[model samples]
Target: MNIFEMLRIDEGLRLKIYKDTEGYYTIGIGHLLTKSPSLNAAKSELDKAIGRNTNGVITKDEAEKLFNQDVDAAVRGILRNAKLKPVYDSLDAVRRAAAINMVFQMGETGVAGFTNSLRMLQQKRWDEAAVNLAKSRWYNQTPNRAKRVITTFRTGTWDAYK
Candidate 1:
């Protein structure tokens, strides 16, 4: 229906604690509780979010709340980025969603780290941008997700999820 719903599917929802692809302890809609030097950090963060101790389960309401916060933060993070903003402004709404979703998972600085790729996007060089993305280590790290996002950037559309 929208970027919000698309991201929910991409990240997938979990009502209980689980390890993400990188083995980081994640909960809810891929919300990273933490994978610090000590898992106590995650426990502390989780308890704080839950407002009490939890036996690794989260309410749908709590999960949605955290997901909304993440989306808000990612939007602000990308929009506030000088380099990312201009590039995002040059894209279609669908391509814009692709970049924003990437930032949601990769962090503002992480996405910005793709200097050449960002440049390609800004230039509306779709294939070039996608190639740059495909060449990145991030692509290798999460090939499935990366490939989808890259495809979105190239074609400005994804229908993998309805």
Candidate 2:
């Protein structure tokens, strides 16, 4: 599976704006409400029609479109980070996609903090990378999602959640 499809499975499809765990308004597969240029700029024109009225809502179609745009940019962000680019380019598609998912959730710097994890990935040590990912606070916060991603990274397969 691709980054967009994988993120839909990971983040779920939320068409209406709702507060996320951090209490920021979010919608469309975890797009946070923010003036952050990268994210907010990715918002679809259809999304512009949302959240201004009592029944403010978007269709699944519109949300997915917005989500695809956001995810593409996020993957590019992952690939653009010099520290991450080597591991990103060396890994298989499934592992590369996992890293992209991580960069989407945690941002490049946050993922970069997993120094040993990136080392393991860079060394092609899948098991260690999986273990390193599982040991993180992010994993502690979201074990099921972590397991799914770790499995994908470990096995070099996209159907880990399946």
Candidate 3:
């Protein structure tokens, strides 16, 4: 089994063969037909983001790069003590991806402390839910970053845009 297979990436985003003009064999990063980048689509962004994050680090910032080199074993390292599985599994696929994306942007521990947001999420409050999730002790230092994520969800633009 290949690495992607081991990672349990859904079949839609599985790698495929893309033909060149010369009819040479070339591997594609993600499936084309079944995988589109839309809210209800095949989740192409996750394919790139999940692998690129490989825990956390985002090495080289390339489309296909996995396992950020700045830190060894980043993929495993980031998830080592993460409390993400519960939150991840509890959310819908889109929300789950959003949570993971947020966790990717912020560290796992940083995400864990979002108790206020967690309550809002459990109550099924979307706008306040999004705001609460962006509540981080370290966020004040970088207002724009947290605001970006929170605002995206609060304004209801995330589902509409992506």
Tell me, by TM-score, which candidate is best: 1
Stronger candidate by TM-score (2 vs 3) = 2
TM-score of each: 0.92, 0.83, 0.43
* lDDT for each residue of candidate 3 in 11-104, tens digit (9 for 90 to 100): 1121433432223222232212232223323234334544532321222233244323212232343346445555455555445444544554
Each model's C-alpha lDDT?
A: 0.85, 0.76, 0.43
Compared with the true structure, what per-residue lDDT tens digits does model 2 show for residues 1-162?
A: 687778888888788766555455677787765533343433443256353332436778767766777788887887788888888989987788898888877778999888889999989898888888888889998888889889988999877866
Top model number, lDDT: 1
Which residue segments of model 1 deviate by more than 4 Å?
160-162
Candidate order (TM-score): 1, 2, 3
Our model 1 lands, by Cα RMSD against the true structure, at: 1.5
Off by over 4 Å in 3: 1-63, 67-83, 152-162
**Model 3 compared with the native: what TM-score?**
0.43
